[PDB]
Structures are given as C-alpha cells and as structure tokens.
C-alpha cells in the first residue's frame, strides 16, 4: 500500500520564488516515483517520472530530486502558469499510490474588488422566485466579506456564494453571491444593496439598485 505522505498541504509562493514539495514513503521504493500537475478543471499531466527525468515538454524550472524514501519536487521560478495542484506517485509496488496532493496558490499585492449587481430577470420572476446576484471581480486576497442588505436590513441564511480558483493570469480571485428569495418579498421592498468589506478598502464599498423594470 506504501503510503505516500505529501507535504505541505497548501503552499503559497510569489512569482519568481521557488516552491518545494516533499513526499515521504512508508518504506523504501527506489527510483519509481513520479509527479503530476493538475490545473483546476482538466485532468492530470505527467511532469516527472523515474524521480528525476522530465517528460518531453516540461520546462527545466521543474525539478524532481531525492531518492530512497524521500522525494521532492522543486519549481525554480514560480510563474502564474504553475498555479495548480501537484501530486506525488509511487510505482515500484502495487497498488500504485498517490500522495495527498499539494495546492499551490500565489501571493501578490492586494486588489480591491470591482463590484457589480444584477437584478433578477423578468424571466425568473414568473417561475415564482427572484434570484439576485452580486459579483466581486478580480481581487486579492480571497478573504472577502459580502453582506446583503435589503432596505437597510441585513439578511442571513438566504444567500450563497462561490469563489473562483486563482486566475491563471491575474493571480486574483472572484466571488459571486446570490440572494435567493420569493417573487413575493422581491416585489415588496425596493432597495437591494450589496456591501463588501475587503481588506483593501477603508470603509465598506457598496453597489445597489431599485426595482426599475
């Protein structure tokens, strides 16, 4: 079963910094170790096999080293294009084993979010539900507080949010918040407000609307 323990679980370097990932075996394997890179979405890509050889195409900035029971992969000049999850594998003894994986984010200057709001489509209203969407575009870090305030009143439990994986080119994130209420209450109140408190602003910035048409 050879348990491949991978460390760390979540690393985070800056563009140009170097990344180091270690994978320890529970018993000596030898040289049959490998590493794969999985970018969010698509499946894994082979990066290094036989502990240190690079698969054709893989840039020289990726280095596989170590041997015996401790293996390590290094990224010399971390570039936004390396943002992804990485995996360690062992193929000397069955069953083939993988490491727990490491997620690699990127540090960068802050970015306040560009906030937008979208009233519910006339379409959805008919179905008897009114979904209101607030969007926070390209910001960093991801720690962002989105508070929904319908007519000077705060909501809670009646809204969900999703955050994108780190942009493979901006190193930023993006968040959407959807206030889901009944076609009933939506026709009642008039002021729909979205307030966001990011660690990049002085006071809570806010976008809002009023049932127009």
């Amino acid at each position: 079963e050879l348990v491949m323990t991978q460390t760390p679980k979540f690393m985070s370097t800056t563009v140009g910094d170097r990344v180091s990932i270690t994978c320890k075996a529970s018993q000596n394997v030898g040289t049959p170790v490998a590493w794969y890179q999985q970018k969010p979405g698509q499946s894994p890509k082979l990066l290094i096999y036989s502990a240190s050889n690079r698969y054709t195409g893989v840039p020289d900035r990726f280095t596989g080293s170590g041997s015996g029971t401790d293996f390590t992969l290094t990224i010399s000049n971390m570039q936004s294009e390396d943002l992804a999850d990485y995996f360690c594998q062992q193929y000397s003894s069955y069953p083939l084993t993988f490491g727990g994986g490491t997620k690699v984010e990127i540090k960068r200057t802050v970015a306040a979010p560009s906030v937008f709001i979208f009233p519910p489509s006339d379409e959805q209203l008919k179905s008897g539900t009114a979904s209101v969407v607030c969007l926070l575009n390209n910001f960093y870090p991801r720690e962002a507080k989105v508070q929904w305030k319908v007519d000077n009143a705060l909501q809670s439990g009646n809204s969900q949010e999703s955050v994108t994986e780190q942009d493979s080119k901006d190193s930023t994130y993006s968040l959407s918040s959807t206030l889901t209420l009944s076609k009933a209450d939506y026709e009642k109140h008039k002021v729909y407000a979205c307030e966001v408190t990011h660690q990049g602003l002085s006071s809570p910035v806010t976008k809002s609307f009023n049932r127009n048409e």
Binding site: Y36, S43, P119, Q124, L135
Partner: protein
C-alpha cells in the same frame, strides 16, 4: 494524435451498476496497458486497476477488486470498467489513462443518487448599463436548479473565451445545484455584439442557448 475519449457524465441509482467506456486511437491500442483512476470531489487520487489490451490479463487494487471489473475489445479499441453495488462513496470522477499515464481522458463524472435528473433553467444576468461601469461591462448567465453535476458552459459557441469566469457549482438547500457564468467585455460593444451563453447538461440530455441583451 493520441486521444482517449470517454463516456459522458452519467447518473446512476444507488445499488445499480455502470459500465464506463474509453475509446482509444492515435496509437496501437494492443501495445500499451490501460489504467483507471478514481478521483472523487476535492480528494486525492486512487488507482483502481490495470488491464492488458492484448492478452486480457488484469491486476486490480485489492480494494475495488470486488466492486469493479475491467474488460476490453480488441477490435474497436475500447476499455470498459464496470462498477457494481454503487453507493455514495462511489460517486467520483473516473479517468482512464495509458500505461505510463502520459495520456489521460477527460474523465467521466459518476453521481450515485436515488434522486433523478433535472435539467437546469437558464436566466440572463443583464449588463447593467448603470450598475456595470468602469469602461468595461460584466454580463452573464445564471444556471439554476439542475442535478446532478456537471453542467458545462461556453460563450458564443466557444468563439468567446477571454474574460470568462465560470463559477464552481453550489448545492442549494433544495438539493439541486446552481451556478453562474460571467464575462467582462468592452462597454461599447453591448449595442452591437451579441452574447449568447451555451449551457450543456448531459445527464438530462439538455442544451440551452440564451441571448443576453442589455436590460432596459
């Protein structure tokens, strides 16, 4: 070019059994062995088993040994893995890769639920000519109330791909998944260029095309 096209996302009822495909080409199939890997939402990676296309011999991970079975078809160049007595733990994304895992498939998403499929509705997030400024405008599509994952969404038939952000799916209380896809574009084009989002939900054989026009 080496390609490993596979089954589309399939929903399967608890206890039933599914048989996944993996059609190979671009290389002499009977030479390299075939693998199968289970991923499963946000977790690691588990090797399932190996199968030799030529002979027919196989080697399984003495874990899925009982639940899965690998077979092939010398002619059509297709590998088959069959899962039986499926449970919630069995829900995951399955990949078939070539011997040295240099080539993988896009993977098939297998969701095990007693619930039944439901095609998503699609509502437009209208470009707010007043609440979407700064020289550039944001617009999008809300993909709501569908099950199970996944749903793929591209814009203007794939012709538009820059500034596109498709958010991860969210499971609502209703037990249905919701999701949205936005895109930033030059404000000046809102009056000339047409934006259409194409939403695809294989599990229910659904395809929707929605035009997003500036709300007035």
């Amino acid at each position: 070019q080496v390609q490993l096209l596979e089954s589309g996302a399939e929903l399967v009822k608890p206890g039933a059994s599914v048989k996944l495909s993996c059609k190979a080409s671009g290389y002499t199939f009977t030479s390299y062995w075939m693998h199968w890997v289970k991923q499963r939402p946000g977790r690691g990676l588990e090797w399932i088993g190996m199968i030799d296309p030529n002979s027919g011999g196989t080697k399984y991970n003495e874990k899925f040994k009982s639940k899965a079975t690998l077979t092939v078809d010398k002619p059509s160049n297709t590998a088959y893995m069959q899962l039986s007595s499926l449970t919630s733990e069995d829900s995951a994304v399955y990949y078939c890769t070539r011997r040295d895992m240099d080539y993988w498939g896009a993977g098939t998403t297998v969701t095990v639920s007693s619930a039944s499929t439901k095609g998503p509705s699609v509502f437009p997030l209208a470009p707010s000519s007043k609440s979407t400024s700064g020289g550039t405008a944001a617009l999008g599509c809300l993909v709501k109330d569908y099950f199970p994952e996944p749903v793929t969404v591209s814009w203007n038939s794939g012709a538009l791909t820059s500034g596109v952000h498709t958010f991860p799916a969210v499971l609502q209380s209703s037990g249905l998944y919701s999701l949205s896809s936005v895109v930033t574009v030059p404000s000046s084009s809102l009056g000339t260029q047409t934006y259409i989002c194409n939403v695809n939900h294989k599990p229910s054989n659904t395809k929707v095309d929605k035009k997003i026009v500036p709300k007035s």
